[PDB]
Structure formats: C-alpha cells, structure tokens
C-alpha cells in the first residue's frame, strides 16, 4: 500500500491495531491510550520538552520505544508493534507515521523516509519464540479460564466472544495485540499496569461508610461499584447524593494472588489461551 498518509490511515484502523487503544476525537471508541486528535501539534511540544529534533522524531520514538516516555495518566501498555504478535512491517510503520503527521500537521514523506533505518525490521525480530516449559494447549487454558471450581476464575470478570462476566476489560482479540510477557505480568503483577478506566475508586458516604472498588456505571443519580474480595465480587449501588468523597487509586481488582492459586500448568495453559485470542 506504500508510504502515504492514506495508507497509514488504513493501517491505524486496520492491522496496525492502533485503534484498539487509540481514538481520534469522535472517531473510534477506544480509551486504553491517549486520544490522538491534534497529535501532530502535541508531538512538537513533547519534542521540545524532551530535547528531540522534531515532533516527527517523537512520533518515531513513541512507536519504536513505547516505554521510553510514558504520557502522563497512562501506564506501560503499548506494545512494540514491530515485534510479535503484530509484526508490523517497516513500510507499514512509515505509512502510519505519515498518517499521524496528518493529525493536525502536514505529512513530510521525505522526512519520514529518512527514519527508515531507525525502525526495527519485524522479520528480524530479536524476540525468542514463546515456549512454555510444559506441554499445554489453548483449549486447556480455555477450560481453566472459565473453571468456576478453581480458587480464581478469569471468566468471572473477563468476557471472551460472549462468554464470561463483564467486570474487567473484554479480552476478545487480545492475543493479536499483546505479548505473552504482558500476559504474565498482567496475571502475576496485576496492579503494575492498569487498563485506563479500570482504576479502583475509594468512596466515602455521608454516613461515613467506605466502599472501594471499580466503577461499573456512573449516571446522574447512582454510582454502581464492583467490590472485590478473595477473587469474589459484589455490586453496590450508591446514591450519588450520599457520596462525600471519592479518590481514584492506581490499584486493580484483577486478583493479586493468582500466582498462589494456579498451578504451574494452569498458569501456562491460560497464557496459551490468551495468545490464541486473535
Ligand atoms: C494498547 C495496547 C495500544 C496500542 C495497540 C497502541 N497504542 Fe499507542 N499508546 C498507548 C498508550 C497507553 C500510550 C500512552 C503511554 C505511552 O507509551 O506514552 C500510547 C502512546 C502513544 C503515542 C504518544 C501519544 C502522545 O500523546 O504523546 C503515540 C504517537 C502512539 N501511542 C502511537 C501508536 C500507534 C501508531 C499505534 C499503532 C501502530 C499504537 N500507538 C498502538 C496504547 C496503545
Ligand atoms: C475480577 C476480580 C477479575 C478477575 C477474576 C480477573 N481479572 Fe484480569 N482484570 C480485571 C480488571 C479490573 C482489569 C483492568 C485493570 C488492570 O489490572 O489492568 C484486568 C486486566 C487484565 C488484563 C489486561 C487486559 C488488557 O486489556 O490489557 C489481563 C491480560 C487479565 N486481566 C488477565 C486475567 C486472567 C488471566 C485472569 C484469570 C487468571 C483474570 N484476569 C481474572 C479484573 C479481573
Ligand atoms: Ca510512550
Ligand atoms: Ca493489570
Ligand atoms: Ca460484602
């Protein structure tokens, strides 16, 4: 499809997977990462603050080394899209950069092409294949994911293709986006990265009653929280007019002792299942 902002648009909303986390104003609905409307102008300001040569260089850096600068208000969730699973080609990354420049700026093809030697080549990825130390299958991991008899049941909070209960984010298609290393960290260090919007809020009512949990739904008159305890959940509906204070906390209700509740085999099988969610 070549290096053009028009090709980059197809990739951003296509196999670049960018629109699974980013929206552009009212285009798209994803909120995992920053809204990219006006990104071209924003990048110029980040480049000045960070000592880079241009906003375009900041955009390049944001793709090749997502962890190097973390936008305030977000965690380190953006994958290196040139690595598996996405394995976005160098030509596709250049096209995406042209599209990003068009978000409030003008694409500069000559300038973009000069960064080609800085974009890692997906075919030459340094990532070693993911091979669990036991034989496990994705089908085995699906059984674990939904097993209600275990001390932890992912399906109590996560939905996949219409199955499971919606508390945390739906995981449909996540294996097309994230690495097994991210899945390991999500399960064993759940509060290390918190999907945007799934923070725990600490609420205090006028009567002095505390409620700590995830906001399920927030309307004009009622706030519904999901409380978590020992992998079990419960909903409470709090009248808004009874809320005295509320404070967001950078902690997750994705359970913190999964490493103690799953066997080695269950753990690696669940990871295989997630990888298979394409
Ligand atoms: C969710 C798993 C993401 C995917 C898929 C993509 N991006 Fe992302 N991006 C994400 C987050 C949480 C953040 C903020 C934290 C950080 O790493 O800085 C970002 C940031 C960017 C930026 C910088 C934006 C800014 O305001 O400075 C850019 C330019 C960007 N991301 C680009 C981008 C592209 C082109 C993607 C598809 C190839 C893409 N991202 C996917 C989360 C996620
Ligand atoms: C309710 C008590 C949950 C249970 C049971 C499980 N998860 Fe969870 N998960 C939950 C929340 C509220 C969030 C968002 C905040 C955060 O910690 O990031 C998550 C997140 C994840 C993710 C990241 C999803 C993403 O889109 O990036 C993963 C991969 C994940 N959780 C995996 C997972 C597994 C394997 C579980 C069973 C062992 C599991 N979760 C249970 C809430 C809850
Ligand atoms: Ca970044
Ligand atoms: Ca997490
Ligand atoms: Ca209770």
Author numbering: 39 to 316
Sentences from the paper on this structure:
Kustd1711 is a putative electron transfer protein encoded on the nitrite oxidoreductase (nxr) gene cluster of anaerobic ammonium-oxidizing (anammox) bacteria and consists of two heme-containing domains and one additional domain. Here, we describe a diheme cytochrome c with high heme redox potentials of about +350 mV, despite having a large overall negative charge, which typically reduces redox potentials. High-resolution crystal structures, spectroelectrochemical measurements, and high-end computational methods show how this is achieved: each heme iron has a calcium cation positioned next to it at a distance of only 6.9 Å, raising their redox potentials by several hundred millivolts through electrostatic interaction.
This showed that these mutants are able to support both six-coordinate heme ligation as well as calcium binding, although in the M292H mutant, the plane of the distal His292’s side chain is at an angle of ∼75° with the plane of the heme porphyrin system rather than perpendicular to it. The M→C mutants did not show clearly defined transitions at low potentials and showed considerable hysteresis, which precluded meaningful fitting. That the crystal structures of the mutant showed a fully occupied calcium site in both domains is probably because of the high (200 mM) calcium concentration used in crystallization.
